[PDB]
């Protein structure tokens, strides 16, 4: 019949998922663990390359109208509104929206304003797609639900963000999340999974630096009878003291050059000699684990989650970028455009709704495209329209 018989259980699916995580990556802490990651030169690089193509796609965007004359007028007004935000551009919005690859979540608030003077005087633009940073949100409950765990009523922002050195209704907010189903409000950050590998990768690099510094192979060792050493310590103005002070400086400066040599007395008291000079070496076998290949495995382990693992040497990286683009477009096409047209009472059928199409992330091949037009053109399957002509 026409009646729901269950709940999405948003408030339970979360509370199981916070337990099943290591405690350094639960909500109020993940905000710090993200920014204490990134400073790894493989983690920054993966995120930077992802944002490189996201910005490119949302730079040369287009709005595709319908067939009727009403849709064409609506498409022009949509393009004006999206290209005339006061102090904002879609590239800035795209690079703010794509932050859910770091925190599983992204919050944008829609603000509308009236036009004073212009082509569309009397209508409503969008002033700013105000980004709400994840760090300024509520650390206790960020997202508030019904009396039951069925749906979401709004998002809470901390009171400490209104200071220099509140609950926003859900209808005003555009939510984007990734890595989880529709029942996970706090999405799974792609850095979850990487975390254990990042912890190991760091530790190994630390061992390499201290290990290389402490490999005192070939160090110089000198043996002197203790009679001379003891006499110097108690008689600072004795000939033994002068020679000991000379050794402490001469041995420090003992390099290899044009005049390097050693001259020692050859006296002998027992099976061992009184004076000797030998260069030390590891009496046995050295290290075995070859920490170099340990790090390489963990680096490929981290970059694979971001699709940027090819730097260790249609593709995986290009397909990964398309995922982020489609998530943003769904919020833009289905949450802002229908509401924006409602304010200016432009009510159209489903088939006449214009939509925004993102740009292409891979450049067109001049060699391939030019010879593709000929092959289609030489048969006559290519229409004669200004759309085809303008493509050159």
């Amino acid at each position: 019949r026409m009646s729901e018989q269950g709940t999405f259980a948003l408030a339970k699916v979360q509370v199981d998922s916070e337990r099943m995580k290591a405690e350094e990556i639960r909500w109020p802490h993940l905000i710090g663990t993200a920014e204490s990651m990134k400073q790894d030169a493989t983690v920054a690089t993966g995120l930077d390359m992802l944002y490189t193509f996201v910005e490119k796609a949302f730079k040369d965007f287009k709005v595709i109208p319908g067939e009727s004359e009403e849709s064409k007028k609506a498409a022009k007004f949509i393009e004006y509104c999206l290209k005339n935000m006061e102090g904002q551009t879609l590239r800035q919005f795209a690079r703010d929206a794509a932050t859910f690859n770091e925190y599983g979540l992204s919050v944008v608030e829609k603000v509308y304003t009236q036009i004073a003077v212009g082509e569309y005087v009397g209508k409503y633009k969008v002033k700013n797609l105000a980004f709400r940073p994840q760090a300024s949100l509520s650390r206790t409950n960020p997202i508030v639900y019904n009396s039951d765990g069925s749906a979401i009523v709004g998002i809470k922002q901390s009171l400490s963000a209104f200071q220099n050195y509140v609950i926003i209704p859900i209808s005003r907010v555009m939510l984007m999340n990734t890595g989880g189903s529709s029942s996970q409000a706090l999405g799974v950050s792609p850095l979850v999974g990487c975390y254990r590998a990042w912890r190991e990768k760091i530790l190994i690099e630390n061992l390499e630096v201290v290990g290389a510094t402490k490999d005192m192979g070939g160090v110089i060792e000198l043996k002197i009878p203790s009679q001379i050493l003891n006499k110097a310590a108690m008689d600072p103005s004795s000939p033994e003291a002068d020679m000991v002070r000379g050794l402490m400086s001469d041995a420090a400066n003992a390099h290899s050059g044009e005049q390097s040599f050693f001259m020692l007395p050859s006296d002998t008291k027992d099976n061992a000699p009184q004076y000797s000079m030998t260069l030390k070496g590891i009496d046995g076998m050295g290290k075995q684990y070859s920490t170099a290949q340990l790090i390489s495995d963990r680096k490929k382990s981290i970059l694979d989650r971001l699709g940027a693992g090819f730097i260790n040497v249609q593709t995986i990286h290009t397909q990964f970028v398309q995922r982020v683009n489609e998530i943003i477009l769904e919020a833009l096409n289905e949450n802002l455009l229908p509401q924006l047209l409602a304010l200016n009472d432009i009510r159209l059928p489903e088939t006449e709704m214009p939509y925004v199409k993102a740009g292409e992330i891979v450049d067109v091949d001049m060699e391939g495209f030019s010879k593709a037009i000929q092959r289609i053109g030489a048969v006559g399957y290519l229409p004669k329209t200004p759309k085809v002509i303008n493509r050159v």
Binding site: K12, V15, D16, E18, R19, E23, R26, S147
Partner: protein, 330 residues
């Protein structure tokens, strides 16, 4: 499944049992549900009638009327919490008790606790309506409410006693005369043909059928509802009987004391009501109440899991006058 050290055996199946939970009163739908906001409620009464006129001489004095009557009452609501916790030791090395070697999972214990809590809440709700029908609220160990509606409103308990040992006297001739007369004289409004229902303990209902009068009534010709050869109420656990434009029902639950039965009419407006209040939480405080609240928390330190459930409601009977304590003697 493992037998002694060097031998094995075959696991066969699982057997589970649980006591019955009754829902007859819930099924009858005699209680209306109200979802309030506070923990205090008001009821307004307004009773009116008329007097008699006496004769007077012509041209002399006249006669005057009296005035009406009003009353106001207030009530409170109790609280009912229920909590439990789960520790590592309960699942550390205990076999699931299901399949041969599946280790114990926290989810299974959580579901067991859910089922137990739901059953306990259902039993408490069932007991509440039975307590309310008797004319008093249900709030054990909580003298804060303990409301006796007979005393609160002002009334008395009609008995309408019946003796079954008199084979030569039909028991229905006492129930009619006392109960139906009292109910008709106390309906309060101007109605007609109110339907009468009776709740009877097993002993009372069983003794009533065996009375020679009832058996002789239906024996000599078929009629319908063949008591002698069929079963009252078919194969259902709760027997049903209808005699002399009355409906009789057997109380399997046993809440009614053995041998006792309560007679009350149907159809009367606002005779029974139940109110729900919000829980002790910031989300629900001052909000609209709900039937039942259940909460679950998994410790962020991986060393604990807890379950929480609470509810708060009150059952009120607005007319103690129309409940009669039938008592049998054997």
């Amino acid at each position: 499944m493992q037998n002694g050290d060097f031998q094995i055996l075959d696991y066969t199946g699982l057997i589970s049992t649980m006591p019955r939970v009754d829902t007859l009163l819930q099924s009858m739908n005699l209680f209306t549900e109200h979802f309030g906001r506070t923990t205090v409620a008001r009821i307004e009464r307004l009773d009116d009638g008329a007097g008699d006129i006496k004769a007077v001489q012509r041209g002399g004095v006249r006669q005057h009327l009296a005035n009406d009557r009003k009353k106001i009452v207030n009530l409170n609501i109790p609280f009912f919490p229920l909590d439990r916790s789960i520790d590592r030791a309960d699942i550390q090395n205990f076999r699931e008790f299901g399949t041969e070697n599946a280790p114990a999972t926290v989810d299974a214990e959580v579901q067991r606790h859910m089922a137990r809590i739901r059953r306990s809440h259902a039993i408490l709700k069932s007991k509440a309506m039975y307590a309310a029908l008797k004319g008093t609220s249900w709030s054990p160990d909580d003298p804060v409410s303990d409301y006796n509606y007979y005393d609160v409103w002002g009334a008395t308990q009609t008995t309408a006693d019946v003796d079954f040992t008199k084979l030569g006297v039909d028991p229905i001739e006492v129930l009619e005369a006392e109960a139906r007369a009292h109910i008709i004289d106390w309906a309060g409004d101007n109605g007609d043909n109110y339907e009468i229902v009776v709740l009877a303990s097993r002993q009372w209902f069983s003794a009533l059928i065996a009375h020679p009068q009832v058996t002789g009534a239906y024996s000599q010709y078929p009629s319908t509802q063949e008591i002698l050869r069929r079963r009252l109420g078919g194969n259902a656990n709760n027997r049903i009987f209808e005699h002399k434009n009355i409906l009789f029902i057997e109380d399997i639950s046993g809440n009614i004391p053995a041998g006792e039965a309560y007679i009350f009419p149907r159809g009367i407006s606002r005779m029974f009501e139940i109110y729900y209040a919000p829980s002790d939480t910031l989300r629900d405080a001052n909000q609209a109440a709900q039937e039942l609240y259940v909460f679950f928390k998994e410790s962020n330190y991986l060393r604990e899991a807890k379950i929480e459930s609470e509810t708060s409601f009150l059952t009120v009977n607005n007319r103690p006058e129309l409940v009669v304590k039938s008592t049998g003697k054997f």
